[PDB]
Amino acid sequence: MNTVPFTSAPIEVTIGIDQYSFNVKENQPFHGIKDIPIGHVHVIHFQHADNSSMRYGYWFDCRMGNFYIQYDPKDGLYKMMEERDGAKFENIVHNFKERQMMVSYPKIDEDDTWYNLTEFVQMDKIRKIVRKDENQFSYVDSSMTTVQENELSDPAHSLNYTVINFKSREAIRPGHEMEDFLDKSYYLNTVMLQGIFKNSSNYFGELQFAFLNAMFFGNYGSSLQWHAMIELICSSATVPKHMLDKLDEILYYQIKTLPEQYSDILLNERVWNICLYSSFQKNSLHNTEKIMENKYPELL
Amino acid sequence: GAMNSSNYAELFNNDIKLFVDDTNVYRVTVHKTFEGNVATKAINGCIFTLNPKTGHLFLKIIHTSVWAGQKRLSQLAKWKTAEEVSALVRSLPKEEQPKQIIVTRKAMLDPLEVHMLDFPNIAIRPTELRLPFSAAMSIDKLSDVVMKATEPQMVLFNIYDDWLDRISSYTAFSRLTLLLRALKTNEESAKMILLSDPTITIKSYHLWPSFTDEQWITIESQMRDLILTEYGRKYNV
Numbered sequence: 411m412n413t414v415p416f417t418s419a420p421i422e423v424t425i426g427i428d429q430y431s432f433n434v435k436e437n438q439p440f441h442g443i444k445d446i447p448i449g450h451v452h453v454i455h456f457q458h459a460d461n462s463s464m465r466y467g468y469w470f471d472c473r474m475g476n477f478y479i480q481y482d483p484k485d486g487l488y489k490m491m492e493e494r495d496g497a498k499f500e501n502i503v504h505n506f507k508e509r510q511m512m513v514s515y516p517k518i519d520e521d522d523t524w525y526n527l528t529e530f531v532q533m534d535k536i537r538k539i540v541r542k543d544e545n546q547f548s549y550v551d552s553s554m555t556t557v558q559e560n561e562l563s564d565p566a567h568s569l570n571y572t573v574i575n576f577k578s579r580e581a582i583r584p585g586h587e588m589e590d591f592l593d594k595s596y597y598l599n600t601v602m603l604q605g606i607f608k609n610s611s612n613y614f615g616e617l618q619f620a621f622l623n624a625m626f627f628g629n630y631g632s633s634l635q636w637h638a639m640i641e642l643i644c645s646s647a648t649v650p651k652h653m654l655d656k657l658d659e660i661l662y663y664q665i666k667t668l669p670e671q672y673s674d675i676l677l678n679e680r681v682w683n684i685c686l687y688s689s690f691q692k693n694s695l696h697n698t699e700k701i702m703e704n705k706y707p708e709l710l
Numbered sequence: 711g712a713m714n715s716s717n718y719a720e721l722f723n724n725d726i727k728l729f730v731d732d733t734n735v736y737r738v739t740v741h742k743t744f745e746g747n748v749a750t751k752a753i754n755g756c757i758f759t760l761n762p763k764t765g766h767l768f769l770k771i772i773h774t775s776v777w778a779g780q781k782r783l784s785q786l787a788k789w790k791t792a793e794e795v796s797a798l799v800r801s802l803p804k805e806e807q808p809k810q811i812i813v814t815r816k817a818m819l820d821p822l823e824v825h826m827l828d829f830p831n832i833a834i835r836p837t838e839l840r841l842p843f844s845a846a847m848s849i850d851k852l853s854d855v856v857m858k859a860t861e862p863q864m865v866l867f868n869i870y871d872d873w874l875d876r877i878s879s880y881t882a883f884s885r886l887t888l889l890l891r892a893l894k895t896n897e898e899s900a901k902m903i904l905l906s907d908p909t910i911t912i913k914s915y916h917l918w919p920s921f922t923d924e925q926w927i928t929i930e931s932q933m934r935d936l937i938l939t940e941y942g943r944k945y946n947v
């Protein structure tokens with residue numbers, strides 16, 4: 411079990427760790443988060459009490475180094491940093507644990523939610539979508555745009571998701587225009603899975619990462635990407651059977667975790683209705699269709 | 711974007727453009743079968759591709775053989791239209807290729823856009839005008855060439871005959887749309903108006919009668935009268 415210590419908490423802030431969150435008051439004696447489960451990526455995110463503009467945060471994996479948070483009063487935000495001195499770090503953590511100045515990652519032992527939301531998400535793939543190579547962790551916020559969004563403006567600060575575009579030459583074989591537009595199996599299986607992602611685990615990882623950035627930061631380009639990657643599978647007549655079954659599980663847990671009060675901006679009515687009721691795979695997503703119909707029957 | 715009554719003179723500026731109407735591409739008669747079921751029998755069709763400035767009509771005849779053994783024909787018809795329009799554009803010299811293609815039905819937008827991905831500088835646009843081009847098969851010489859075809863064929867016409875020697879393309883297009891709206895409204899009455907008089911003939915190389923300027927005004931008035939009446943007859947006014 412690992413620890414992300416905080417130097418201090420000089421500004422009042424709601425701190426999130428994965429799907430959990432807690433309120434810290436200005437100058438409260440808060441010195442970090444302990445008992446973080448090893449073996450999964452994690453995201454630690456922030457919403458300042460005085461500015462609900464810009465939710466922001468950091469994706470990290472405690473196996474890749476010792477990370478801590480320190481508020482920067484110039485840039486006005488809580489910054490993740492890496493401590494290279496391992497004995498200094500253990501010594502700081504042990505002192506703050508002894509003073510009981512840390513919150514405990516509050517995982518219920520029946521609870522597989524976080525694993526189910528991040529099954530295919532790896533730090534190495536996050537770091538290629540979020541390019542900032544001198545750091546082992548990745549910063550995301552509400553306002554970052556996607557590579558695709560900038561093509562329709564700072565490139566250093568972009569989300570380099572895989573560009574999916576259903577009306578593009580990559581998606582449409584010369585001479586197969588109608589076939590490939592109405593059945594996206596070529597684009598899914600040859601172009602994307604075999605060509606770009608190499609396997610469905612990398613495809614699912616990017617899809618899961620897109621959703622989580624949409625949910626935790628309200629990143630609109632991430633929501634677009636999540637929906638595009640769903641729609642590409644649903645609109646393919648030919649999908650490996652194991653991918654359909656896993657997609658159903660993936661989406662089920664995303665829909666289960668989505669705040670009910672964000673459903674109206676995080677869920678695209680057209681895509682979901684098409685996917686569950688019109689597409690080739692309309693009868694392949696039983697778990698997802700059942701939760702969507704019991705939780706968000708209005709949308710549909 | 712979409713084309714409507716505000717940007718109507720754009721049709722007659724010097725940017726090459728084409729209207730595409732797909733309403734006569736897939737045509738059927740519905741009949742009973744011996745068992746008392748209903749079946750369709752396709753008949754020959756056509757794509758109506760028109761340059762509104764010049765009057766050039768690229769009439770691609772759609773022979774029934776293109777539907778043999780195919781499913782979902784009304785969807786296929788839109789993609790076959792787009793394929794044929796794309797082939798036409800590629801066959802044209804660069805300087806004759808259109809800068810815009812305006813489809814009369816919005817369902818043609820995605821098929822045409824996909825088929826024209828190679829031509830990113832050709833704008834594909836819909837229109838909010840209620841154009842009467844479905845009545846093209848009410849023009850006898852166009853109907854005749856479509857129904858006689860035994861194989862796919864492209865036939866080139868000028869749908870304005872020689873009118874552009876005396877009137878502008880704006881006026882020629884208004885005349886065409888009035889004639890075709892009347893034909894679509896009440897074909898028999900429209901055709902009576904146009905041909906009642908045995909002394910006004912259609913030249914062998916034309917589609918419409920050789921009316922003088924004064925006769926065209928009279929003809930045009932008669933077509934208006936026809937449409938306004940049928941409008942009352944239908945709504946009662």
Ligand SMILES: O=C(O)[C@H](NC1CC1)c1c(F)cccc1F
Pocket residue numbers: 840891895937940941944
């Ligand atoms: O129902 C109409 O409004 C009318 N069609 C009726 C047979 C006269 C009509 C026009 F007169 C012109 C353009 C579109 C139309 F639908």
